[PDB]
Design a protein around this ligand. Structure first.
Ligand code: NAI
Ligand code: FMN
Ligand code: SF4
Ligand code: FES
Lengths: 85, 213, 430
């Protein structure tokens, strides 16, 4: 989860097409590889508003805390018995 | 020796296996030993029962044990490939199991393994061409003070010399069944030159019983 | 008492250890078994647990946990679930054949131990997980259990005490790891015998999900004798925290390999030369002794001269007591071949569940198989030591420890013999 730590700003992907000579991915988009890194969401929003970029924000999707129990694999009456180990 | 199955014509889910009805009553008595709702706990006896009716486990005994216990067939395949008794290949009618761990290797189980090899004309893992003797090499059978020893199908043959195992094989080829005991002078596990203990008669009920009982 | 051993025949628990008397019910009641069992049952769980705590009984399975402290984990109120005593009758340890003798020759003692122990722990039934290889012993035990039901000693209103108690026998199917208590639980439940992690301990989550105490055949069978003879009688043998009597299996390179009941802190040399007729070729022919079955580190001749056969004096001798199974090895032994065969046993008997045992026990078997031939160099000895220290302590159950300890004992006491083996390989193959 070390790649899910900091906020990122990317841009909309523009056209990539085939080079007629070699078959490479040609582009006309200067901002096609521009990925910016921000500590918090509001620093990213402030950097987008400072540069006149129309932005949209997706909120951080955090994994909810699960209830883990090893002995629950070996219950008396519940369906959470494992059939093998 | 493999742990994946390939359908041979004699081992497939269309191989005829089915229990006898007295074995169905035995399976009912097995399943009544476990709590209601834990019928899967009867996988290990019933499958072993399938090894006693048939001699080995095709993949129809495993599927039948899976079906009559309402367990998935993989959960029977795991039990069949985990535990070393379940013969997933047909063995001979007498399944000779020589123990070669350290308390038996120190008392020369190598000479007895060589004796069974040079007697039957086979080696470890092979079955004799009449399908009567299968020789393999097993770990500690739990008869260490009676070393060296072998197991044949239920029975421990203990304190063996190569002549003793030659004679046991000779009378297994003749149809009789020998006595599962130490082929030396002693009876079960006592010191071989007479009792060093338990010579006095046992006391009986009431001896040494504390007050207030 | 200061010197221990020379146990008297009147002070024996396992009378008819040798099969010389009638193992059935009319023979067993004529030897003190099933006598005043109802008066043991009626005095409650707390009295029986106190008599087991007073006696100082430790776990005869081999780890030596205090038996009263272990069984008092069940003295707790019912939470709807039933409670189970489970008898560990697997006995897969090389060297160890004592539980075979208890089941084969004193089966009613085990059945009365099931009844008394399950009364102490409030248990509903006894699942005797017997070894699958012990078929004749299992039918032997089933005959005794039929005799116990037909006499009304167990079952409905067991011994006339108003206590309902069943005794079941589950046969194994050929796995040494199914003697480990959680893997034995998983084997009773119809699965692969793979050990559970701890916690939950089996007193919390055990067989079928129930409160469950797994205990050895010996620590269960000696419990009616502790209840009848008193706990102080059992604590009056052996050293302090090393109380009682013990079955010993002296096998290997002795004159008379045998099972013997002996007092707890007996000297090893006295036990060997008194009950087994001594080492073959004399005591000066002694090379090593594996004191307590395969899992314990071996000890050489200079430790075997003075050592006591209990838990604590063998821990101080940097080995363990274990199952008190004495494997004696004379000077004619290729000791590397014996230890490498023992490591081969531990890779054949290893359930494959966690990484350090599944990979490192096979890797130790490959290294030990090259050490037999000497096809190595001395820097691989210390490396092998490190491999054992990466298996020991990091595994789920103690079979990784029991695979690491023979390697560590062989290195610690016979590093020069390994080095001369490898240098003579080097000078005869180069
Ligand atoms: N008799 C035989 O055939 C064999 C015996 N062994 C012996 O087994 C020993 C290892 O046994 P283990 O059970 O793995 O060792 P040990 O760490 O776990 O535990 C011994 C007993 O004490 C109980 N216990 C310990 N701490 C507890 C706690 N905090 N709460 C509740 N219960 C607790 C456990 O449930 C177990 O029954 C080895 O030292 C070896 O001597 C090994 C192989 C074969
Ligand atoms: C790999 C392994 C195998 C074991 N096998 C047995 C066994 O066969 N019989 C036994 O009584 N204990 C065996 N034990 C010890 C048990 O874990 C447990 O401590 C014992 O069975 C019950 O506790 P007790 O010593 O108080 O009776 C084994 C332990 C391990 C790690
Ligand atoms: S260390 Fe070995 S014996 Fe233990 S759980 Fe892992 S594979 Fe099993
Ligand atoms: S070592 Fe062969 S029976 Fe235990």
């Amino acid at each position: 989860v070390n790649n899910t730590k900091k906020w990122k700003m990317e841009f909309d992907t523009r056209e990539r097409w085939e080079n007629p000579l070699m078959g490479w991915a040609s582009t006309a988009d200067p901002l096609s590889n521009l990925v910016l890194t921000f500590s918090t969401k509001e620093d990213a929003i402030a950097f987008a508003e400072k540069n006149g970029w129309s932005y949209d924000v997706e909120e951080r999707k955090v994994p909810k805390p699960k209830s883990k129990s090893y002995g629950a694999n070996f219950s008396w009456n519940k369906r959470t018995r494992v059939s093998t180990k | 020796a493999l742990f994946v199955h390939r359908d041979t014509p004699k081992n497939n889910p269309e191989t005829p296996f089915d229990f006898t009805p007295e074995n169905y009553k035995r399976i009912e008595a097995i399943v009544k030993n476990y709590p209601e709702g834990h019928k899967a706990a009867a996988v290990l006896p019933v499958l072993d029962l399938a090894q006693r009716q048939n001699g080995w486990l095709p993949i129809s005994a495993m599927n039948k044990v899976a079906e009559i216990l309402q367990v998935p067939p993989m959960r029977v395949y795991e039990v069949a490939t985990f535990y070393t008794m379940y013969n997933r290949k047909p063995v001979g009618k007498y399944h000779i199991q020589v123990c070669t761990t350290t308390p038996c290797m120190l008392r020369n189980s190598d000479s007895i393994l060589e004796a069974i090899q040079k007697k039957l004309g086979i080696k470890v893992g092979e079955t004799t061409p009449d399908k009567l003797f299968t020789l393999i090499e097993v770990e500690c059978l739990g008869a260490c003070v009676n070393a060296p020893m072998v197991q044949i199908n239920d029975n421990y043959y203990e304190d063996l010399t190569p002549k003793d195992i030659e004679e046991i094989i000779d009378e297994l080829k003749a149809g009789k069944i020998p006595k599962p005991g130490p082929r030396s002078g002693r009876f079960s596990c006592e010191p071989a030159g007479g009792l060093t203990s338990l010579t006095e008669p046992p006391k009986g009920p009431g001896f040494g019983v504390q007050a207030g009982l | 008492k200061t010197s221990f051993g020379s146990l008297k025949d009147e002070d024996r628990i396992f009378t008819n250890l040798y099969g010389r008397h009638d193992w059935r019910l009319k023979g067993a009641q004529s030897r003190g078994d099933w006598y005043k069992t109802k008066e043991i049952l009626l005095k409650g769980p707390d009295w029986i647990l106190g008599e087991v705590k007073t006696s100082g009984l430790r776990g005869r399975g081999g780890a030596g946990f205090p038996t009263g402290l272990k069984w008092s984990f069940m003295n707790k109120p019912s939470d709807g679930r039933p409670k189970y005593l489970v008898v560990n009758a697997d006995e897969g340890e090389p060297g160890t054949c004592k539980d075979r003798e208890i089941i084969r020759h004193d089966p009613h003692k085990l059945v009365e131990g099931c009844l008394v122990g399950g009364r102490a722990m409030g248990a509903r039934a006894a699942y005797i997980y017997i070894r699958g290889e012990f078929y004749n012993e299992a039918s032997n035990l089933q005959v005794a259990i039929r005799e116990a039901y037909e006499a009304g000693l167990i079952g409905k209103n067991a011994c006339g005490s108003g206590y309902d108690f069943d005794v079941f026998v589950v046969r194994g199917a050929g796995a040494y790891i199914c003697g480990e208590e959680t893997a034995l639980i998983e084997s009773i439940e119809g699965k692969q015998g793979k050990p559970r992690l701890k916690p939950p301990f089996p007193a919390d989550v055990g067989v079928f999900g129930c409160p469950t105490t797994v205990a050895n055949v010996e620590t269960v069978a000696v419990s009616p004798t502790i209840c009848r003879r008193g706990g102080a009688w059992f604590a009056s043998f052996g050293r302090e925290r090393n109380s009682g009597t013990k079955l010993f299996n002296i096998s290997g390179h002795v004159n008379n390999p045998c099972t013997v009941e002996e007092e707890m802190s007996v000297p090893l040399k006295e036990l060997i030369e008194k009950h087994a007729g001594g080492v073959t070729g004399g005591w000066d022919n002694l090379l090593a002794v594996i004191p307590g079955g395969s899992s314990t580190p071996l000890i050489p001749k200079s430790v075997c001269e003075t050592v006591l056969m209990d838990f604590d004096a063998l821990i101080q001798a940097q080995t363990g007591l274990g199952t008190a199974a004495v494997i004696v090895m004379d000077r004619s032994t290729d000791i590397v071949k014996a230890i490498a065969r023992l490591i081969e046993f531990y890779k054949h008997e290893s359930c494959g569940q966690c990484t350090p045992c599944r990979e490192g026990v096979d890797w130790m078997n490959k290294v030990m198989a090259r050490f037999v031939r000497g096809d190595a160099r001395p820097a691989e000895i210390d490396s092998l030591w490190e491999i054992s220290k990466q298996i020991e302590g990091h595994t789920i159950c103690a079979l990784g420890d029991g695979a690491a300890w023979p390697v560590q004992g062989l290195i610690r006491h016979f590093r020069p013999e390994l080095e001369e083996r490898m240098q003579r390989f080097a000078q005869q193959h180069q």
